[PDB]
Design a protein around this ligand. Structure first.
Ligand code: HEC
Ligand SMILES: [Zn+2]
Ligand SMILES: [Zn+2]
Ligand SMILES: [Zn+2]
Ligand SMILES: [Zn+2]
Ligand SMILES: [Zn+2]
Ligand SMILES: [Zn+2]
Ligand SMILES: [Zn+2]
Ligand SMILES: [Zn+2]
Ligand SMILES: [Zn+2]
Ligand SMILES: [Zn+2]
Length: 83
């Protein structure tokens, strides 16, 4: 399973190639991933829950689109943006 390939296919349109949100993502409410303070207060389970369930009117749920293994493979991608 390629995490980065999944991210570019499903996430980059809102969150950006570097974790800095696009025009679409920012307008919907997304903040940058390369944020030390965000990374520090955010658990892996919070990242997994967000991918799975989304946020109403902000981010679609991905639980019917990706297996738990695919969701888990995205954690290091999100973590790898920092600074
Ligand atoms: C545009 C429709 C989006 C797509 C496609 C994806 N995400 Fe997203 N995400 C979006 C918004 C507007 C927000 C803010 C809403 C909120 O409740 O925080 C988010 C949030 C995240 C978060 C952070 C949650 C937190 O606790 O701070 C993560 C980790 C995240 N999103 C990851 C993510 C991944 C891995 C995606 C592809 C499968 C993805 N998102 C798609 C907008 C959009
Ligand atoms: Zn896919
Ligand atoms: Zn998709
Ligand atoms: Zn900060
Ligand atoms: Zn971890
Ligand atoms: Zn929760
Ligand atoms: Zn939950
Ligand atoms: Zn959520
Ligand atoms: Zn939220
Ligand atoms: Zn809606
Ligand atoms: Zn809706």
């Amino acid at each position: 399973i390629d995490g980065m390939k999944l991210y570019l296919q499903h996430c980059k349109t809102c969150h950006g190639v570097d974790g800095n949100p696009t025009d679409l993502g920012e307008g919907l409410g997304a903040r940058k991933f390369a944020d030390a303070e965000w990374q520090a207060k955010t658990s892996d389970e919070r990242i997994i829950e967000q991918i799975n369930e989304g946020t109403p009117e902000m981010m679609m749920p991905f639980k019917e689109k990706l297996t738990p293994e695919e969701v888990k493979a995205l954690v290091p991608v999100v973590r790898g943006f920092k600074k």
